[PDB]
């Protein structure tokens, strides 16, 4: 996107939401991708498979996430790997955003999963997408156990309405 | 007007712990008067007069008059100290009204 956003959506959203100054036009700052792969301690291979998955889906190297505090109810320890996370900004973030919105959403069997709600009350949106499939990589064959992704778009928008407006302008279904 | 208390000046040699105890042994009550635009004034009151005034309910909400000779003050009751076991009043505060 990038240039397309800068050309159209800036002025379009400015006149749509009636904002006086340019500096507070809503923008997207970062996108975070997470796989909370619990109980990786037993297998030690699903986690490194997940990091590979992240590497193919987004052209950035993942960083494994260590546990904070130990809980008896679960089996996690003080500081051992229990997850993986990635952050995307700049042109790579616009890329991932477009190649996700245009392609992945029609692919999945169900539809209308993402409601116009679920903003955190300050203009940032969170979604969960199931199955590493529907992404530009190999299908159920040549992959390890299936996995799910959490996608968070963090915006400069102050209110949920302004966040919704920015997302629908790009083409978020709801 | 309706409530009037006759008082005498309480001097520095009449202030303190032992002096106050001697005054109460003589059946008197120490009081202080403070308020806007004037310095505090220390006075002595009669125990029977104070008890009689406190028995009435209008004493706590009406302007009272304290007369030390020629000097006259119009004040409201502000704070009162009582003995923990005998309930006898021990010291009084008066805010200028």
């Amino acid at each position: 996107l990038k240039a397309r956003y800068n050309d159209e959506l800036k002025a379009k959203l400015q006149e749509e939401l009636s904002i006086k100054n340019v500096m507070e036009i809503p923008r997207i700052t970062k996108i975070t991708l997470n796989m909370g792969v619990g109980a990786a301690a037993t297998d030690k291979k699903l986690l490194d498979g997940a990091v590979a998955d992240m590497q193919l889906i987004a052209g950035q190297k993942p960083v494994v996430t260590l546990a904070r505090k130990s809980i008896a109810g679960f089996k996690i320890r003080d500081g051992w790997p229990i997850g993986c996370k990635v952050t995307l900004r700049g042109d790579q973030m616009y890329e991932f955003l477009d190649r996700l919105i245009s392609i992945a959403i029609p692919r999945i069997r169900d539809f209308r999963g993402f409601s116009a709600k679920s903003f955190d009350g300050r203009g940032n949106y969170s979604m969960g997408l199931k199955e590493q499939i529907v992404f530009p990589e190999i299908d159920f064959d040549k992959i390890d156990r299936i996995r799910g992704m959490d996608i968070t778009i963090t915006t400069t928008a102050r209110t949920d309405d302004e966040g919704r407006a920015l997302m629908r302008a790009f083409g978020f279904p709801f | 007007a309706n409530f009037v208390l006759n008082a005498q000046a309480r001097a520095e040699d009449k202030q303190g712990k032992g002096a106050s105890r001697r005054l109460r042994r003589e059946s008197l009550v120490p009081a202080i008067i403070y308020g806007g635009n004037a310095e505090p004034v220390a006075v002595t009151l009669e125990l029977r007069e104070l008890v009689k005034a406190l028995e009435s309910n209008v004493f706590f909400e009406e302007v009272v008059e304290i007369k030390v000779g020629d000097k006259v003050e119009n004040v409201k009751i502000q704070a009162l100290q009582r003995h923990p076991a005998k309930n006898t009043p021990m010291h009084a505060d008066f805010k200028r009204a």
Binding site: - | F60, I77, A79, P84, A85, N87
Partner: protein, 137 residues
């Protein structure tokens, strides 16, 4: 038998009972109250007995506020034991009473009945008491 649910320590020093009760000497919850005039100790059984007498007399027509709690443990030796060999065992709990401390308050009854109940209760206590009523200041 009032007693703390748990304590930080089990045994405490004897101490000394001195001074007056400047705190807890004003009628706050009800309209009429009974307060101590000389110092002493009050046990949980004494508290229970006085409460039972007051409640029985007033027939539970008003509300009784108890303002003393026995948070001090007292120990004793097992009997026929020589001096030394450690501190004794906790037997009962007491509250220290200073002159001017209010023990019971009653809300919602006539003064004649409240005074008669307080007179009934005062015969169960190991120190002298008196009756007070609420006042503006």
């Amino acid at each position: 038998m009032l007693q703390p649910k748990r304590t930080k320590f089990r045994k405490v020093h004897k101490g000394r009972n001195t001074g007056l009760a400047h705190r807890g000497s004003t009628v706050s919850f009800g309209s009429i109250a009974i307060k101590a005039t000389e110092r002493g100790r009050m046990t949980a059984r004494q508290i229970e007995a006085a409460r039972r007498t007051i409640s029985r007399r007033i027939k539970r027509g008003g509300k009784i506020f108890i303002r003393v709690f026995p948070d001090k443990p007292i120990t004793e030796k097992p009997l026929e034991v020589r001096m030394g060999n450690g501190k004794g065992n906790v037997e009962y709990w007491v509250c220290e009473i200073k002159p001017g401390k209010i023990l019971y308050e009653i809300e919602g009854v006539n003064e004649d009945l409240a005074r008669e109940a307080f007179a009934l209760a005062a015969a169960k206590l190991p120190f002298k008491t008196t009756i007070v009523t609420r006042t503006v200041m």
